[PDB]
Protein backbone atom coordinates (compact mmCIF):
# COMPACT_ATOMS: atom_id res chain seq x y z
CA UNK A 1 0.00 0.00 0.00
CA UNK A 2 2.45 2.67 -1.19
CA UNK A 3 1.97 6.32 -0.27
CA UNK A 4 1.59 8.06 -3.64
CA UNK A 5 2.15 11.83 -3.84
CA UNK A 6 1.09 13.85 -6.88
CA UNK A 7 2.60 17.33 -6.99
CA UNK A 8 0.26 19.54 -9.02
CA UNK A 9 -3.51 19.49 -9.28
CA UNK A 10 -3.70 20.51 -12.93
CA UNK A 11 -5.27 18.59 -15.78
CA UNK A 12 -2.80 15.71 -15.65
CA UNK A 13 -2.48 15.51 -11.89
CA UNK A 14 -6.25 15.44 -11.35
CA UNK A 15 -6.77 12.87 -14.13
CA UNK A 16 -4.18 10.60 -12.50
CA UNK A 17 -5.68 11.00 -9.03
CA UNK A 18 -9.24 10.45 -10.25
CA UNK A 19 -8.28 7.37 -12.24
CA UNK A 20 -6.24 5.88 -9.38
CA UNK A 21 -9.21 6.43 -7.05
CA UNK A 22 -11.49 4.64 -9.51
CA UNK A 23 -9.05 1.69 -9.42
CA UNK A 24 -9.06 1.61 -5.61
CA UNK A 25 -5.63 3.26 -5.27
CA UNK A 26 -5.21 6.14 -2.82
CA UNK A 27 -3.06 9.16 -3.66
CA UNK A 28 -2.53 12.67 -2.29
CA UNK A 29 -2.45 15.74 -4.55
CA UNK A 30 -0.30 18.65 -3.32
CA UNK A 31 -1.25 21.87 -5.11
CA UNK A 32 0.28 25.32 -4.69
CA UNK A 33 -3.05 27.08 -5.42
CA UNK A 34 -5.05 28.12 -2.37
CA UNK A 35 -8.30 26.64 -3.70
CA UNK A 36 -10.05 24.83 -6.52
CA UNK A 37 -10.57 27.98 -8.58
CA UNK A 38 -7.86 30.27 -7.24
CA UNK A 39 -6.49 30.87 -10.76
CA UNK A 40 -8.89 32.06 -13.45
CA UNK A 41 -8.89 29.83 -16.56
CA UNK A 42 -10.64 31.35 -19.54
CA UNK A 43 -11.28 29.96 -22.99
CA UNK A 44 -12.15 26.61 -24.49
CA UNK A 45 -10.32 23.39 -25.30
CA UNK A 46 -10.97 20.92 -28.08
CA UNK A 47 -10.65 17.41 -26.63
CA UNK A 48 -9.45 14.72 -29.02
CA UNK A 49 -10.97 11.23 -29.26
CA UNK A 50 -7.71 9.35 -28.60
CA UNK A 51 -6.52 11.55 -25.73
CA UNK A 52 -8.65 14.16 -23.95
CA UNK A 53 -11.91 12.38 -24.74
CA UNK A 54 -10.51 8.93 -23.92
CA UNK A 55 -9.46 10.25 -20.50
CA UNK A 56 -12.93 11.59 -19.71
CA UNK A 57 -14.38 8.29 -20.92
CA UNK A 58 -12.16 6.24 -18.61
CA UNK A 59 -12.82 8.64 -15.74
CA UNK A 60 -16.56 8.01 -16.12
CA UNK A 61 -17.18 11.57 -17.34
CA UNK A 62 -18.41 10.87 -20.89
CA UNK A 63 -21.99 11.94 -20.14
CA UNK A 64 -20.84 14.96 -18.11
CA UNK A 65 -18.51 16.14 -20.91
CA UNK A 66 -21.33 16.60 -23.40
CA UNK A 67 -18.76 25.94 -37.01
CA UNK A 68 -15.01 25.63 -36.41
CA UNK A 69 -14.04 27.41 -39.64
CA UNK A 70 -10.39 28.41 -40.08
CA UNK A 71 -8.96 31.11 -42.36
CA UNK A 72 -5.23 31.69 -42.85
CA UNK A 73 -4.31 35.15 -44.12
CA UNK A 74 -1.21 37.05 -45.20
CA UNK A 75 -0.40 40.56 -43.85
CA UNK A 76 -2.26 42.18 -46.76
CA UNK A 77 -5.38 40.28 -45.69
CA UNK A 78 -5.46 37.81 -48.59
CA UNK A 79 -6.93 34.41 -47.68
CA UNK A 80 -4.22 31.80 -48.24
CA UNK A 81 -6.33 28.68 -47.37
CA UNK A 82 -9.87 28.17 -46.04
CA UNK A 83 -11.21 25.30 -43.96
CA UNK A 84 -14.82 24.54 -42.89
CA UNK A 85 -15.22 18.55 -28.89
CA UNK A 86 -15.19 22.05 -27.36
CA UNK A 87 -15.21 22.54 -23.58
CA UNK A 88 -14.67 25.51 -21.28
CA UNK A 89 -11.40 25.22 -19.37
CA UNK A 90 -12.98 26.10 -16.02
CA UNK A 91 -15.72 23.55 -16.59
CA UNK A 92 -13.18 20.85 -17.47
CA UNK A 93 -11.32 21.47 -14.21
CA UNK A 94 -14.59 21.13 -12.29
CA UNK A 95 -15.31 17.84 -14.06
CA UNK A 96 -11.87 16.47 -13.16
CA UNK A 97 -12.14 17.63 -9.54
CA UNK A 98 -15.52 15.89 -9.20
CA UNK A 99 -13.73 12.54 -9.64
CA UNK A 100 -11.00 13.23 -7.04
CA UNK A 101 -11.95 12.79 -3.36
CA UNK A 102 -12.17 16.21 -1.73
CA UNK A 103 -9.94 15.34 1.23
CA UNK A 104 -7.21 13.89 -1.02
CA UNK A 105 -6.13 17.31 -2.39
CA UNK A 106 -3.89 19.40 -0.11
CA UNK A 107 -4.34 22.99 -1.23
CA UNK A 108 -1.81 25.75 -0.62
CA UNK A 109 1.21 23.40 -0.57
CA UNK A 110 3.94 24.66 -2.91
CA UNK A 111 6.78 22.20 -3.49
CA UNK A 112 10.14 23.87 -2.94
CA UNK A 113 12.42 20.86 -2.46
CA UNK A 114 12.63 17.09 -2.60
CA UNK A 115 15.03 14.99 -0.54
CA UNK A 116 15.62 11.38 -1.55
CA UNK A 117 15.37 8.85 1.21
CA UNK A 118 17.81 5.96 1.67
CA UNK A 119 15.02 3.44 2.33
CA UNK A 120 13.18 4.53 -0.80
CA UNK A 121 10.67 7.25 -1.43
CA UNK A 122 10.99 10.98 -0.99
CA UNK A 123 10.48 13.79 1.50
CA UNK A 124 8.53 16.68 -0.03
CA UNK A 125 9.47 20.15 1.25
CA UNK A 126 6.85 22.91 1.03
CA UNK A 127 7.00 26.71 1.15
CA UNK A 128 4.86 26.79 4.30
CA UNK A 129 7.74 25.05 6.11
CA UNK A 130 6.03 21.67 6.40
CA UNK A 131 6.89 18.43 4.67
CA UNK A 132 5.28 15.15 3.66
CA UNK A 133 6.76 11.73 2.97
CA UNK A 134 5.76 9.39 0.16
CA UNK A 135 6.87 6.11 -1.39
CA UNK A 136 6.00 7.12 -4.98
CA UNK A 137 6.30 10.66 -6.33
CA UNK A 138 4.60 11.87 -9.51
CA UNK A 139 5.62 15.22 -11.00
CA UNK A 140 2.44 16.74 -12.42
CA UNK A 141 3.54 20.31 -11.68
CA UNK A 142 3.57 21.84 -15.17
CA UNK A 143 5.91 23.72 -17.47
CA UNK A 144 8.22 24.93 -14.67
CA UNK A 145 8.03 21.59 -12.86
CA UNK A 146 10.04 21.41 -9.67
CA UNK A 147 10.02 17.58 -9.69
CA UNK A 148 11.42 17.34 -13.23
CA UNK A 149 14.96 17.87 -11.90
CA UNK A 150 14.93 14.46 -10.17
CA UNK A 151 14.62 12.71 -13.57
CA UNK A 152 16.58 14.90 -16.00
CA UNK A 153 18.35 18.24 -16.16
CA UNK A 154 16.64 19.03 -19.47
CA UNK A 155 15.21 22.57 -19.49
CA UNK A 156 12.52 24.24 -21.62
CA UNK A 157 13.87 26.09 -24.65
CA UNK A 158 12.35 29.51 -25.35
CA UNK A 159 10.31 29.62 -28.57
CA UNK A 160 8.28 32.83 -28.75
CA UNK A 161 6.29 35.57 -27.05
CA UNK A 162 2.51 35.30 -26.91
CA UNK A 163 0.17 38.23 -26.19
CA UNK A 164 -3.54 37.78 -25.54
CA UNK A 165 -6.20 40.50 -25.82
CA UNK A 166 -10.00 40.33 -25.78
CA UNK A 167 -13.07 41.78 -27.46
CA UNK A 168 -16.05 41.37 -25.10
CA UNK A 169 -19.64 41.21 -26.41
CA UNK A 170 -18.40 41.51 -30.01
CA UNK A 171 -21.81 40.93 -31.63
CA UNK A 172 -23.21 44.06 -29.96
CA UNK A 173 -20.10 46.22 -29.57
CA UNK A 174 -17.96 45.39 -32.66
CA UNK A 175 -20.39 43.94 -35.23
CA UNK A 176 -18.20 44.50 -38.31
CA UNK A 177 -15.24 42.75 -36.70
CA UNK A 178 -17.57 40.07 -35.34
CA UNK A 179 -18.77 39.41 -38.89
CA UNK A 180 -15.19 39.52 -40.20
CA UNK A 181 -13.99 36.90 -37.71
CA UNK A 182 -17.17 34.84 -37.90
CA UNK A 183 -17.76 31.79 -35.71
CA UNK A 184 -14.38 30.05 -36.08
CA UNK A 185 -10.83 31.44 -36.08
CA UNK A 186 -8.42 33.31 -38.33
CA UNK A 187 -4.63 33.53 -38.30
CA UNK A 188 -2.61 36.07 -40.28
CA UNK A 189 1.02 35.12 -40.92
CA UNK A 190 3.75 37.76 -41.28
CA UNK A 191 7.52 38.04 -40.76
CA UNK A 192 8.22 36.25 -37.46
CA UNK A 193 4.94 37.87 -36.36
CA UNK A 194 1.40 36.45 -36.45
CA UNK A 195 -2.01 37.95 -35.63
CA UNK A 196 -4.84 35.63 -34.63
CA UNK A 197 -8.51 35.95 -33.70
CA UNK A 198 -10.81 33.22 -32.35
CA UNK A 199 -14.52 33.52 -31.58
CA UNK A 200 -15.79 31.80 -28.42
CA UNK A 201 -19.27 30.58 -27.50
CA UNK A 202 -19.54 33.28 -24.80
CA UNK A 203 -19.70 36.19 -27.24
CA UNK A 204 -16.02 37.11 -26.91
CA UNK A 205 -13.27 37.27 -29.55
CA UNK A 206 -9.78 36.43 -28.37
CA UNK A 207 -7.03 38.35 -30.18
CA UNK A 208 -3.45 37.11 -30.07
CA UNK A 209 0.00 38.30 -31.10
CA UNK A 210 2.77 35.71 -31.54
CA UNK A 211 6.28 36.85 -32.40
CA UNK A 212 9.71 35.21 -32.62
CA UNK A 213 11.68 37.19 -30.02
CA UNK A 214 13.94 36.47 -27.07
CA UNK A 215 12.69 35.52 -23.61
CA UNK A 216 13.08 39.04 -22.19
CA UNK A 217 11.11 40.76 -24.95
CA UNK A 218 7.77 40.71 -23.12
CA UNK A 219 9.28 42.33 -20.02
CA UNK A 220 11.09 44.97 -22.10
CA UNK A 221 7.80 46.19 -23.57
CA UNK A 222 6.40 47.28 -20.20
CA UNK A 223 2.80 46.77 -21.32
CA UNK A 224 1.61 46.42 -17.72
CA UNK A 225 2.81 49.93 -16.83
CA UNK A 226 1.89 51.66 -20.07
CA UNK A 227 -1.10 53.82 -20.83
CA UNK A 228 -3.46 51.87 -23.07
CA UNK A 229 -3.13 54.46 -25.83
CA UNK A 230 0.61 53.77 -25.91
CA UNK A 231 0.06 50.00 -25.94
CA UNK A 232 -2.19 50.32 -29.00
CA UNK A 233 0.32 52.62 -30.72
CA UNK A 234 3.22 50.24 -30.03
CA UNK A 235 1.21 47.30 -31.37
CA UNK A 236 0.38 49.25 -34.52
CA UNK A 237 4.09 50.02 -34.88
CA UNK A 238 4.87 46.32 -34.41
CA UNK A 239 2.40 45.57 -37.23
CA UNK A 240 3.66 48.36 -39.50
CA UNK A 241 2.86 47.72 -43.16
CA UNK A 242 -0.03 45.35 -42.45
CA UNK A 243 -3.52 45.82 -43.87
CA UNK A 244 -5.38 48.45 -41.82
CA UNK A 245 -8.43 46.19 -41.78
CA UNK A 246 -6.47 43.45 -40.02
CA UNK A 247 -4.79 45.75 -37.52
CA UNK A 248 -8.08 47.43 -36.58
CA UNK A 249 -8.56 44.32 -34.43
CA UNK A 250 -6.07 45.95 -32.04
CA UNK A 251 -8.18 49.10 -31.62
CA UNK A 252 -11.35 47.06 -31.10
CA UNK A 253 -9.93 45.21 -28.10
CA UNK A 254 -11.03 45.79 -24.52
CA UNK A 255 -8.79 48.55 -23.09
CA UNK A 256 -6.41 47.25 -20.44
CA UNK A 257 -6.80 43.56 -21.35
CA UNK A 258 -3.39 42.23 -22.38
CA UNK A 259 -1.68 39.15 -20.91
CA UNK A 260 1.81 38.29 -22.13
CA UNK A 261 3.66 35.00 -21.75
CA UNK A 262 6.61 33.11 -23.20
CA UNK A 263 6.02 29.94 -25.24
CA UNK A 264 8.67 27.26 -24.59
CA UNK A 265 9.28 23.55 -25.01
CA UNK A 266 11.54 20.78 -23.78
CA UNK A 267 13.83 19.55 -26.59
CA UNK A 268 12.18 17.03 -28.90
CA UNK A 269 12.68 13.42 -27.79
CA UNK A 270 13.56 14.24 -24.17
CA UNK A 271 13.66 11.12 -22.01
CA UNK A 272 15.50 9.72 -19.01
CA UNK A 273 16.45 6.45 -17.30
CA UNK A 274 13.37 5.11 -15.55
CA UNK A 275 13.63 5.31 -11.76
CA UNK A 276 11.89 2.94 -9.32
CA UNK A 277 9.86 5.47 -7.29
CA UNK A 278 9.37 8.75 -9.20
CA UNK A 279 8.09 9.82 -12.62
CA UNK A 280 6.58 12.78 -14.51
CA UNK A 281 3.46 13.51 -16.56
CA UNK A 282 2.07 16.29 -18.72
CA UNK A 283 4.12 19.43 -19.25
CA UNK A 284 6.58 18.34 -16.58
CA UNK A 285 7.36 15.29 -18.73
CA UNK A 286 7.21 16.78 -22.22
CA UNK A 287 6.27 20.49 -22.45
CA UNK A 288 5.45 21.48 -26.04
CA UNK A 289 4.10 24.59 -27.77
CA UNK A 290 0.29 24.91 -27.83
CA UNK A 291 0.10 23.05 -31.18
CA UNK A 292 1.19 19.96 -29.26
CA UNK A 293 -2.22 19.94 -27.52
CA UNK A 294 -0.64 19.38 -24.13
CA UNK A 295 -3.90 19.43 -22.17
CA UNK A 296 -5.09 16.38 -24.10
CA UNK A 297 -1.74 14.62 -23.65
CA UNK A 298 -1.52 15.45 -19.93
CA UNK A 299 -4.96 13.94 -19.36
CA UNK A 300 -3.98 10.87 -21.40
CA UNK A 301 -0.73 10.57 -19.41
CA UNK A 302 -2.75 10.66 -16.19
CA UNK A 303 -5.06 7.79 -17.05
CA UNK A 304 -2.34 5.66 -18.70
CA UNK A 305 -0.11 6.00 -15.61
CA UNK A 306 -3.03 5.04 -13.34
CA UNK A 307 -3.70 1.99 -15.51
CA UNK A 308 -0.01 1.09 -15.17
CA UNK A 309 -0.10 1.29 -11.36
CA UNK A 310 -3.25 -0.89 -11.31
CA UNK A 311 -1.57 -3.38 -13.68
CA UNK A 312 1.44 -3.72 -11.35
CA UNK A 313 -0.10 -3.37 -7.89
CA UNK A 314 2.89 -5.16 -6.30
CA UNK A 315 5.63 -3.39 -8.27
CA UNK A 316 5.50 0.39 -8.82
CA UNK A 317 8.89 0.30 -10.54
CA UNK A 318 7.39 -1.96 -13.20
CA UNK A 319 4.35 0.33 -13.47
CA UNK A 320 6.48 3.47 -13.88
CA UNK A 321 8.72 1.78 -16.43
CA UNK A 322 5.82 0.46 -18.52
CA UNK A 323 4.14 3.88 -18.44
CA UNK A 324 7.34 5.71 -19.45
CA UNK A 325 8.19 3.40 -22.38
CA UNK A 326 4.90 4.32 -24.05
CA UNK A 327 4.97 7.96 -22.91
CA UNK A 328 8.51 8.49 -24.24
CA UNK A 329 7.49 7.15 -27.66
CA UNK A 330 4.29 9.19 -27.87
CA UNK A 331 6.01 12.40 -26.74
CA UNK A 332 8.80 11.90 -29.29
CA UNK A 333 6.35 11.43 -32.18
CA UNK A 334 4.04 14.29 -31.23
CA UNK A 335 6.97 16.51 -30.20
CA UNK A 336 8.65 16.19 -33.58
CA UNK A 337 5.41 16.91 -35.44
CA UNK A 338 4.52 19.86 -33.20
CA UNK A 339 8.00 21.35 -33.70
CA UNK A 340 7.57 21.20 -37.48
CA UNK A 341 4.22 22.97 -37.23
CA UNK A 342 5.44 25.63 -34.79
CA UNK A 343 8.55 26.50 -36.81
CA UNK A 344 6.72 26.54 -40.17
CA UNK A 345 3.85 28.70 -38.89
CA UNK A 346 6.01 31.40 -37.27
CA UNK A 347 8.79 32.24 -39.71
CA UNK A 348 10.26 35.12 -41.71
CA UNK A 349 8.43 33.75 -44.79
CA UNK A 350 5.54 31.88 -43.13
CA UNK A 351 2.88 32.90 -45.66
CA UNK A 352 5.21 32.00 -48.56
CA UNK A 353 5.95 28.58 -47.03
CA UNK A 354 2.25 27.77 -46.70
CA UNK A 355 1.47 28.86 -50.27
CA UNK A 356 4.43 26.84 -51.55
CA UNK A 357 3.11 23.72 -49.80
CA UNK A 358 -0.15 23.86 -51.76
CA UNK A 359 1.59 24.94 -54.99
CA UNK A 360 3.72 21.80 -54.70
CA UNK A 361 0.70 19.55 -54.04
CA UNK A 362 -0.93 20.83 -57.23
CA UNK A 363 1.89 19.25 -59.25
CA UNK A 364 0.81 15.86 -57.89
CA UNK A 365 -2.79 16.33 -59.08
Ligand SMILES: Cc1cc2nc3c(=O)[nH]c(=O)nc-3n(C[C@H](O)[C@H](O)[C@H](O)COP(=O)(O)OP(=O)(O)OC[C@H]3O[C@@H](n4cnc5c(N)ncnc54)[C@H](O)[C@@H]3O)c2cc1C
Pocket residue numbers: 007008009010011012013030031032033044045046109110111112140141142143144145146162281282283284289290292293294295296297298
Ligand atom coordinates in the same frame (compact mmCIF):
# COMPACT_ATOMS: atom_id res chain seq x y z
C1 LIG B 1 -1.40 29.66 -24.70
C2 LIG B 1 -1.64 28.18 -24.56
C3 LIG B 1 -2.67 27.57 -25.27
C4 LIG B 1 -2.90 26.20 -25.17
N1 LIG B 1 -3.93 25.63 -25.91
C5 LIG B 1 -4.11 24.34 -25.81
C6 LIG B 1 -5.16 23.72 -26.63
O1 LIG B 1 -5.91 24.29 -27.42
N2 LIG B 1 -5.27 22.35 -26.45
C7 LIG B 1 -4.48 21.57 -25.60
O2 LIG B 1 -4.72 20.35 -25.52
N3 LIG B 1 -3.50 22.15 -24.87
C8 LIG B 1 -3.33 23.46 -24.97
N4 LIG B 1 -2.33 24.05 -24.25
C9 LIG B 1 -1.48 23.24 -23.38
C10 LIG B 1 -2.02 23.00 -21.97
O3 LIG B 1 -2.45 24.23 -21.38
C11 LIG B 1 -0.98 22.33 -21.08
O4 LIG B 1 -0.20 21.44 -21.88
C12 LIG B 1 -1.60 21.56 -19.92
O5 LIG B 1 -2.22 22.47 -19.01
C13 LIG B 1 -0.61 20.67 -19.20
O6 LIG B 1 -1.30 20.15 -18.05
P1 LIG B 1 -0.43 19.70 -16.78
O7 LIG B 1 -1.30 19.01 -15.80
O8 LIG B 1 0.84 18.97 -17.23
O9 LIG B 1 0.04 21.10 -16.19
P2 LIG B 1 -0.87 22.26 -15.60
O10 LIG B 1 -2.22 22.17 -16.18
O11 LIG B 1 -0.11 23.57 -15.79
O12 LIG B 1 -0.97 21.92 -14.02
C14 LIG B 1 0.18 22.01 -13.15
C15 LIG B 1 -0.34 22.24 -11.75
O13 LIG B 1 0.75 22.15 -10.81
C16 LIG B 1 0.67 23.24 -9.91
N5 LIG B 1 2.02 23.50 -9.43
C17 LIG B 1 3.06 24.03 -10.14
N6 LIG B 1 4.19 24.10 -9.47
C18 LIG B 1 3.86 23.59 -8.22
C19 LIG B 1 4.62 23.38 -7.05
N7 LIG B 1 5.91 23.71 -6.94
N8 LIG B 1 3.99 22.84 -5.99
C20 LIG B 1 2.69 22.53 -6.10
N9 LIG B 1 1.88 22.68 -7.14
C21 LIG B 1 2.53 23.21 -8.18
C22 LIG B 1 0.05 24.37 -10.71
O14 LIG B 1 -0.56 25.32 -9.84
C23 LIG B 1 -0.99 23.61 -11.53
O15 LIG B 1 -2.20 23.46 -10.79
C24 LIG B 1 -2.08 25.43 -24.33
C25 LIG B 1 -1.05 26.03 -23.61
C26 LIG B 1 -0.82 27.40 -23.72
C27 LIG B 1 0.31 28.03 -22.94
Ligand SMILES: [Cl-]
Pocket residue numbers: 173174175176177178
Ligand atom coordinates in the same frame (compact mmCIF):
# COMPACT_ATOMS: atom_id res chain seq x y z
CL1 LIG C 1 -17.35 47.05 -35.60
